[PDB]
């Protein structure tokens, strides 16, 4: 009922007279496909440049639990990429390595130092060596990653 023209009679010509008004798709500027069995609508979370991914992903996954209720029936959020899985795998790995080296050196500096108190002296040289390092990184602004832990 968009008016286009009107006679003296009061008989109007509407937009329905020269056209059909329909609901259609806009020009797609992006297409997403899932598992090669259907087009889908997706969403990506972008992180500020110098911010923590692992930190953000937690809030994101927790905010989604809040929304499982608010979401319509039949609607499913299937995750297609999650950098948090790598963080965990990478930081659990370096942790493990640290623990292994610690126990390996202790065993060694205990087979070349037969006394336990002697071996336990070179052993208390590590857990404290860590502390100073980590307290320093804290004042620095260095977070724990494979490279900073690898050091």
């Amino acid at each position: 009922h968009i008016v286009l023209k009107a006679s003296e009679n009061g008989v109007p010509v509407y937009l329905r007279d020269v056209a059909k008004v329909q609901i259609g798709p806009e020009m797609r500027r992006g297409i997403a496909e899932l598992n090669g069995e259907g087009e889908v609508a997706g969403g990506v979370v972008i992180l500020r440049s110098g911010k923590n991914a692992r930190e953000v992903i937690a809030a994101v996954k927790d905010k989604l639990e809040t929304l499982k209720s608010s979401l319509p029936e039949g609607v499913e959020i299937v995750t297609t990429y999650d950098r948090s899985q790598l963080i965990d795998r990478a930081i659990d790995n370096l942790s493990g390595k640290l623990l292994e080296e610690f126990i390996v050196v202790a065993v060694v500096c205990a087979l070349f130092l037969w006394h336990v108190r002697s071996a336990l002296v070179a052993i208390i040289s590590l857990p404290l060596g860590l502390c100073i390092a980590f307290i320093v990184m804290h004042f620095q602004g260095l977070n724990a990653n494979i490279m900073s832990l690898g050091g």
Binding site: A19, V21, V45, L71
Partner: protein, 150 residues
């Protein structure tokens, strides 16, 4: 450190976008304090300019710097167009990625894009340290008035 500049010049050919939007832009950005290199993308109706800064440049210093140079160039652009400042992040910032699927069919592609655009995007962006929640794929509902020439 990267600052993105997106300018929309609708309907205009690549060569015209390059000449009247992108090229003017890149040549002014190249002479921004701290600029190392500058890339330009001139598409059909779209201009993308990527300003890369030298090592040790305070990211915010850079953005604040691009913004002022963006002011003294806004006029040298076609009347309709405006140079928009991109988000704070970069492609590397893409962290969590998901798809919306309704297996019953009760919701189609447009219904889900709307769900994403007008509900999810706003429930996520409130999260600290998040620069953007971007919609990918799906259909944007359009009211298309199709005119009969006859």
């Amino acid at each position: 450190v990267q600052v993105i500049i997106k300018t929309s010049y609708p309907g205009q050919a690549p060569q015209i976008v390059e000449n009247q939007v992108t090229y003017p832009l890149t040549t002014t950005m190249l002479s921004v304090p701290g600029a190392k290199t500058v890339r330009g993308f001139s598409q059909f109706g779209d201009s993308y300019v990527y300003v890369i800064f030298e090592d040790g440049t305070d990211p915010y210093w850079a953005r604040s710097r691009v913004l002022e140079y963006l002011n003294q160039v806004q006029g040298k652009l076609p009347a309709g167009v405006s140079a928009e400042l991109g988000p704070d992040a970069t492609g590397v910032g893409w962290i969590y990625e998901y798809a919306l699927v309704d297996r019953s069919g009760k919701h189609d592609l447009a219904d889900l894009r709307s769900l994403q655009d007008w509900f999810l995007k706003y429930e996520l962006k409130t999260i600290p340290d998040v620069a953007e929640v971007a919609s990918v794929g799906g259909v944007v509902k359009e009211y298309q008035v199709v005119i009969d020439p006859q």
